[PDB]
Design a protein around this nucleic acid. Sequence first.
RNA 1: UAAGUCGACAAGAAGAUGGGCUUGGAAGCAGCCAUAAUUUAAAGAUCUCGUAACAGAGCACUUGUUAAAUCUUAAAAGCAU
Lengths: 245, 201, 147, 98, 124, 46
Amino acid sequence: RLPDDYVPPTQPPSARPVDTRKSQLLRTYTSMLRSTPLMLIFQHNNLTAIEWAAIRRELSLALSNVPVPEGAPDITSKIHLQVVRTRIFDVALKTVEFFDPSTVEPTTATTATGTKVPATYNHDLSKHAWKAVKEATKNTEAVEKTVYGQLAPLLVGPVAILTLPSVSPAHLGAALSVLAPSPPAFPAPSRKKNPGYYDLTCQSGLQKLLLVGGRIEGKAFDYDGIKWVGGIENGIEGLRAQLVH
Amino acid sequence: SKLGRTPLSIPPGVEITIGEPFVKRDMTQWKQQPKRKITVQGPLGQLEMDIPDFIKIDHDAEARRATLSVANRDEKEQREMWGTTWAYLNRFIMGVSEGHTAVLRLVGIGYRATIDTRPEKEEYPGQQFVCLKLGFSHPVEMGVPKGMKASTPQPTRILLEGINREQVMTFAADIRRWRVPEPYKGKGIFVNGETIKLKQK
Amino acid sequence: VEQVVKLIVGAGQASPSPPVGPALGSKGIKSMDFCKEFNARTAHINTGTPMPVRVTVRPDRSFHFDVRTPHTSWLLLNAAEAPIGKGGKRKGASNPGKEVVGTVSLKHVYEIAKIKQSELRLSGLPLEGLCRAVIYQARSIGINVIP
Amino acid sequence: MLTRFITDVSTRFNPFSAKAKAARLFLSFLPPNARSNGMNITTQLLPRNSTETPLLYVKFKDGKEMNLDVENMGIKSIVEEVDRHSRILQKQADLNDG
Amino acid sequence: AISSCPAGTKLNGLNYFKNKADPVALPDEEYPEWLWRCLEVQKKQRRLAMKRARAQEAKILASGDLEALAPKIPLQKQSVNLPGAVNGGVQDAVLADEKREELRKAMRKERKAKIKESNYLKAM
Amino acid sequence: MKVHSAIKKRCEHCKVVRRKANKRQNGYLYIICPANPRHKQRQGYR
RNA sequence: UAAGUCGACAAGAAGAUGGGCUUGGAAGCAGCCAUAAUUUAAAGAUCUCGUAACAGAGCACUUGUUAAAUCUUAAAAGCAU
Ligand SMILES: [Mg+2]
Ligand SMILES: [Mg+2]
Ligand SMILES: [Zn+2]
């Protein structure tokens, strides 16, 4: 039978309960803050399901028009405009930045057979992460100089984020024209070619979404910088011009 | 109490005066607990209260704030009066600065109200009397307590005003006690948006 | 506040009647004007076909309506080739758990999930999950699905 | 917070400025139907270079025009100030009914 | 061949339009790959069962190694970090979102039951 | 009002209170409800 | 339980779909059968009111604001009412 000291391997000791939605989200937004290189932080103000579905219908239409003959995997199906728990999404930003899993001294845990086996508790829900985040947050002015300090003012109130698996301006420019159009740089779609965009439900929602900022390659950005990044015709192409010099 | 901790913002013109602990001798009690006299003065008028001495007030003048605290949070009596004394002060401050008002709506066929004088029954010179015709064989006349101002913008609406809320809402309830709203037709006197769910027929 | 009414009517058979009469003739809209416009926005459809309609009656009783594709149930039954029953309409299984009125291959499901995606409010829903939703309805109307 | 007695609003803030927390929050309480009912709303985003004095202009249906300071005051202080005026407008409209 | 309906079949009553013919099925090769996997979602005798299965399940235990008999914690109750690494490549990002979504479906399935159970306790 | 020895809430709007307690009597336990006046109950007799 | 407990407040609480049957009518909510899915920050082929039937108001559930630094909830036991 199983002993008492034994803890499952897929359920190590964490700072707080695990089955709660508060922790399953923190475990989610951490991975989301690591994998996704490019994300834009929006602010949503009391939309309805019909308005949400309409906004998400234009993205799908606007993101499916970009040409993808590059042989790379299909990225359109992985871009999402997600609503987040701002209170937790702010914690996930500290954990990703201050916590350093390398500073954990492993400890031997007893398996079901009672044999002591080395096991290091590095997960983001660990007391070592909860402790390093707090102690590192005591200092206030020193935090404003970091990436988290430059983004905390945006994670106030309700917010949503648009994630992209890769930094593909061709994909971002198609998404910026639907959510935060700034003509003539990122012109909204035409009426003769996209009548769905200019519908009561869709148009009534885009007025509630207010782009507030972004985060690219672990660096905070503003609505002005996002335009430039999106303005890049192609990453490889931007490198070729540098070589022509 | 999460309310007592909340500081009290003293608006311009309002002045709070806190006295020193005093005891008035009572021949029927062997020991009277000390109390503090707090006077809230401003444009509309002045109000006074006597609070227990275990309630400490840190009046900040240059900041225009006043927070209350007790000497022992683990005592039931001190916890209770902590929030009660805070609520009364919040009313005193907002009553001497802006004033409290109560609106009475008269619903029914023949329900009217008028403000006049009754020099024969006046408790003090110039006392106003709210005369109500509420389907009774006799007329209903009530004198406004000293410190309140009653008016009637419309025949079926009364408006009370005063610096003391406990005195205003107590008078509004004294008028409503003549015709309490009924559920079958809605006839009665309603105070400050009071409503009543009707019946089937 | 703007009211909305659900009413299923024929393709071009719009007229003051049990379906249309008491459904909209009660709120005070120009019932005759409605049946005149609906019949013009439904001429390309086979006469008699059912068509769900959501008519939004604004304040001042100025209505604007949007016709919708026929119920998926009416399509699944027509695809399963179920036996006609009462009222001249194909009927589903009274006991879906046990009874089985028909069989629809997954090719039928593909077709029934594409005329439904034709709508503009459903044009964004991926066709993959949209074909697993009709399969979720067949289990309710007593219809088997063959690969 | 009550919004029935509001008709126009205008907001200008720098999102990266911690002082704008009240402005970004003020728009949190506006209902969904506000845009359709007739309330005119307008929000501007200032560049991150440096923050300008945020302006949260409010206007009721009675002609009142409030221009509050967003930096020194908190969202709680800004909500009750709008509760005061929106209450007398209802009591005045309550006793004026009929 | 895997399809019960060969090409050219007429789908009964799927053309509510006037100037058109009922849809006609196409070859199985053209049809998208996802379609053929859609039906993954379709989920005395006791004496004979408790006579052989009980004897069969016994040796299935084979309690020489207890680790294989672990409680099998669901995905909604674990604490292991999800597969997300900085600049780990587009493939890692794609394979990361699949697990984030894989966890969403688990919390969903558990929320449905909590809702059904709450309703049952309320109408008892 | 219904006088019972076992007073119970019958909805989410019912509240238990002890009223009529003063320096002379201990009072009674009451079930008061602003929604339905048929939920009004008293525990104890005068 | 500052990864904001508890309470209040603000908004949301979708779509296939009015599931099939039954019935004059049965559209989550007379009754019967089913109740794998789908998409979401979440949303029971439906827990309480409501309609002749629709509509409509709440709940489960979801996010936000306010806000506690010995201060949440439950059970058992002792003494009381
Ligand atoms: Mg039914
Ligand atoms: Mg019913
Ligand atoms: Zn009750």
